[PDB]
Amino acid sequence: GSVSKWVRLNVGGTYFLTTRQTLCRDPKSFLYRLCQADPDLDSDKDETGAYLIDRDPTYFGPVLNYLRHGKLVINKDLAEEGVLEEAEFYNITSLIKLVKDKIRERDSKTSQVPVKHVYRVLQCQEEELTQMVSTMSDGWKFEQLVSIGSSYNYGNEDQAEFLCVVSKELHNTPYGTASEPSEKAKILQERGSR
Amino acid sequence: LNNNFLQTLNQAWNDHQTAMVMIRDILMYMDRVYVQQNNVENVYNLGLIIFRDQVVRYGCIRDHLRQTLLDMIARERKGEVVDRGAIRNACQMLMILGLEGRSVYEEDFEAPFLEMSAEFFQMESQKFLAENSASVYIKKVEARINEEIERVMHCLDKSTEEPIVKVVERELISKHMKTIVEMENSGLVHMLKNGKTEDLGCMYKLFSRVPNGLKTMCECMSSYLREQGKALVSEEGEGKNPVDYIQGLLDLKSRFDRFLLESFNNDRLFKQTIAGDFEYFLNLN
Amino acid sequence: MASNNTASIAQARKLVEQLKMEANIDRIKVSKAAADLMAYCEAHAKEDPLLTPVPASENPFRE
Amino acid sequence: SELDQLRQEAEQLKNQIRDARKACADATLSQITNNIDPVGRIQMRTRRTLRGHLAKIYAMHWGTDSRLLVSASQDGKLIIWDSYTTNKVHAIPLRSSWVMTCAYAPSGNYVACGGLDNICSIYNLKTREGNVRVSRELAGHTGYLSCCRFLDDNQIVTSSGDTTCALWDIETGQQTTTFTGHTGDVMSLSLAPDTRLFVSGACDASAKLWDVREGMCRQTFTGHESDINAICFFPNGNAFATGSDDATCRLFDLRADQELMTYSHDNIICGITSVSFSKSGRLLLAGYDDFNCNVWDALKADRAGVLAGHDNRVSCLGVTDDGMAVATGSWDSFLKIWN
Numbered sequence: 001g002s003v004s005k006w007v008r009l010n011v012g013g014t015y016f017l018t019t020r021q022t023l024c025r026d027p028k029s030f031l032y033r034l035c036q037a038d039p040d041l042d043s044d045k046d047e048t049g050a051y052l053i054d055r056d057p058t059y060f061g062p063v064l065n066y067l068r069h070g071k072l073v074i075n076k077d078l079a080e081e082g083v084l085e086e087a088e089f090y091n092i093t094s095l096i097k098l099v100k101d102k103i104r105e106r107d108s109k110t111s112q113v114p115v116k117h118v119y120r121v122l123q124c125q126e127e128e129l130t131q132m133v134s135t136m137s138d139g140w141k142f143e144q145l146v147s148i149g150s151s152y153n154y155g156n157e158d159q160a161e162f163l164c165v166v167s168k169e170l171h172n173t174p175y176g177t178a179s180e181p182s183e184k185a186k187i188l189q190e191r192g193s194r
Numbered sequence: 195l196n197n198n199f200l201q202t203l204n205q206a207w208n209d210h211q212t213a214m215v216m217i218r219d220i221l222m223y224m225d226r227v228y229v230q231q232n233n234v235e236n237v238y239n240l241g242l243i244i245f246r247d248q249v250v251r252y253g254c255i256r257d258h259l260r261q262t263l264l265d266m267i268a269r270e271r272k273g274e275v276v277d278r279g280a281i282r283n284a285c286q287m288l289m290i291l292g293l294e295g296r297s298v299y300e301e302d303f304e305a306p307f308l309e310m311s312a313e314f315f316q317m318e319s320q321k322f323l324a325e326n327s328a329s330v331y332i333k334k335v336e337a338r339i340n341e342e343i344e345r346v347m348h349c350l351d352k353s354t355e356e357p358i359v360k361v362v363e364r365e366l367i368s369k370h371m372k373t374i375v376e377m378e379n380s381g382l383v384h385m386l387k388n389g390k391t392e393d394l395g396c397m398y399k400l401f402s403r404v405p406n407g408l409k410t411m412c413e414c415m416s417s418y419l420r421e422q423g424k425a426l427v428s429e430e431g432e433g434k435n436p437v438d439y440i441q442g443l444l445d446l447k448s449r450f451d452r453f454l455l456e457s458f459n460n461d462r463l464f465k466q467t468i469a470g471d472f473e474y475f476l477n478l479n
Numbered sequence: 480m481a482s483n484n485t486a487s488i489a490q491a492r493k494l495v496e497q498l499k500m501e502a503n504i505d506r507i508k509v510s511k512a513a514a515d516l517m518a519y520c521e522a523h524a525k526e527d528p529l530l531t532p533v534p535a536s537e538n539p540f541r542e
Numbered sequence: 543s544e545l546d547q548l549r550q551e552a553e554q555l556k557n558q559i560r561d562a563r564k565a566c567a568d569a570t571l572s573q574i575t576n577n578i579d580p581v582g583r584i585q586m587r588t589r590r591t592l593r594g595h596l597a598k599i600y601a602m603h604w605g606t607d608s609r610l611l612v613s614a615s616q617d618g619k620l621i622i623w624d625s626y627t628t629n630k631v632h633a634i635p636l637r638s639s640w641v642m643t644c645a646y647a648p649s650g651n652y653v654a655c656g657g658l659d660n661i662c663s664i665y666n667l668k669t670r671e672g673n674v675r676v677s678r679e680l681a682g683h684t685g686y687l688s689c690c691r692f693l694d695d696n697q698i699v700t701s702s703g704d705t706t707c708a709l710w711d712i713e714t715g716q717q718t719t720t721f722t723g724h725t726g727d728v729m730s731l732s733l734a735p736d737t738r739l740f741v742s743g744a745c746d747a748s749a750k751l752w753d754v755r756e757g758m759c760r761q762t763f764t765g766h767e768s769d770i771n772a773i774c775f776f777p778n779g780n781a782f783a784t785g786s787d788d789a790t791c792r793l794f795d796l797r798a799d800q801e802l803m804t805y806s807h808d809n810i811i812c813g814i815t816s817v818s819f820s821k822s823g824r825l826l827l828a829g830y831d832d833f834n835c836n837v838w839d840a841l842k843a844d845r846a847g848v849l850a851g852h853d854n855r856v857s858c859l860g861v862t863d864d865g866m867a868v869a870t871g872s873w874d875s876f877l878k879i880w881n
Contacts, residue, residue: 123633137635138671166635180660185727501555501799502559508798509568513803516778519778528867530825540879541589542626
């Protein structure tokens, strides 16, 4: 790469005519090395004089978009996973991390489809009640309110008078985990069970 | 062995690095994922470590390198033009291969170069005291300090600056104090009476580089000052003239204050060690 | 060398490094430090309501 | 290969430290001066039986006005108690289950909660709407959170599993400065009121006092043989009390670089699970696995009194940050304000 600043690639058989500057945005990129001459690189097509990147152009689109203008938007019909897997092949770490966040955000929104709902119980006296009902944490839902009779501060105005169940949908937005091998966590779990 | 060992090892290193770069380009990946998860070092670091454990810390290569390097730098010290840049590459090996510390450089070339410099300075001191006067000896040690800076910026590493310079300070000056004061018309006391404050300043910068040198200056200046003062205040013949008794002390005062300003730039100890003597002689006036 | 218990040189090096400055940190004897602490506590004993019970109109847990 | 040097040097370094520490060791005048300023009996009554929680309370953190008390229960709820009225300013449901730590910001605008999710949830306690919208779910923990504390309202240090107590930038969610060196899980975390050192108590029974700016461990205090439950820094930024599974609590002084004093009683073999300093620092409130807590005279090494009136372990203590009374967050689902 020492000629034709608008260097022409043949990514998946698609002629991408892209400037050196965009590719040189992140030198951590496989393509940044193609922007410059190096002797090991002997991957070429002699039918168009354009070098070969035997990866599909269907997911190369969003990758090139991010790399050109520091941000990508994946289509609502194109797999985020495919963009990710095409992403590490050029080794742009920040892009991969951001796409991981996007993927896990999406999967959290589709873990809703399995019957997975996080439930919580709050306790409230009559006065404060609506205050949590109104200013309750955004992204949850009210599910049930039960009045339980009291003799400590008889009936109304007792703290233990009302029980309010709330719930949201199970999510794995930054990530989900099934176990932590750390022993002390298990010890505390056993202690707090009874 | 029909070409000097430093050049061949340097060329082998350069070939190793030029092949290693492209292996880095290949294995950009496992360096990003397998390394930090498995508590292993960086792939470039691992390859440098293997190059270390197979070539440079292996016996014969290390010893032949050290012998060739010491002979070649001694020859350069004697005035022969040699490839200092190959010595640069050697020194950057003995740095970057060492990882965090200074260990391998200390073992291979840093310490033996320090020792050869010390031995060279030893015979330098004996030689320049056996044939030449004190002025040539001091000019030689100062010029060798300058050449230490030259070898730091052209032939050695910046991190090697403070050891070898220290080597010049301890070897040439520390135990060669009295002889610098003595030897006729080349010493400190002899340029004291001449009034040539420039050579006094030369002594001053030379000994400010070595700890406790200012104390030896204080001892010498005070010794000469007290001989002059005792020759002045004491009564000789019928009796010393008021020119040589009252105001002669003032002449000595002006002379030594001129030294204090024009040679030593008015350090506290230097002004005190002469002011006390002036006080002592004034009570004898 | 990462085959030496997976590059234990770094962890041992930082262990030694951390062990270094502990000595260079000041060493001021136990009795004097204890004296400092009792001086602070007794001086502040009057301003600790736990040691100085206070009226019901000036504490928020009987007002 | 070279490790043979590194260990022996370390071996002698500790030796030197011992030689230094034993040199610094003098008679503690506090136990000597048990005649001066006798505290006598201390009797306190609980005046706020805040019973909104219905599961074991794990941590609290009094506000910087000693009015808004954030207390977490492992069910996944935070209660910002209004301690002056026994009212809940906020009941906040957490997506994380089994929260153990709640850190109250110096501004009362953010709150921090860490559970068995490896996620440090940072909740904006107030928005333009008024609902409690989460500000940032800090990710990047390689283990479980055990305690966290704010430095600024955009910088936060946490104590996590797998030898990690890194310092995070809240905005990015990235741990700016990863502190490493512990040989075990890091449970406790106490901040100096100097906001320059944080002392991490790990499972290796050693309290590593760390600088907060870059990676450098100020000291490695070690008097315990058991993992550290809680650390309470003195209000002078010069010493800290440390509890562990052993019935011994220990006071470690920076200036002496050694255990200034010990706090153990044959009467109580239960491990001191929570330590807290009074406003003066004269008294030391110790919570116990025993179903009540006690108070030592921290400069007499004797039980200044007993706070009883629970039926399950007092897993955390809190003291108003001007000193007025003590919250005892027990596993009985009650918080009691002993005044």
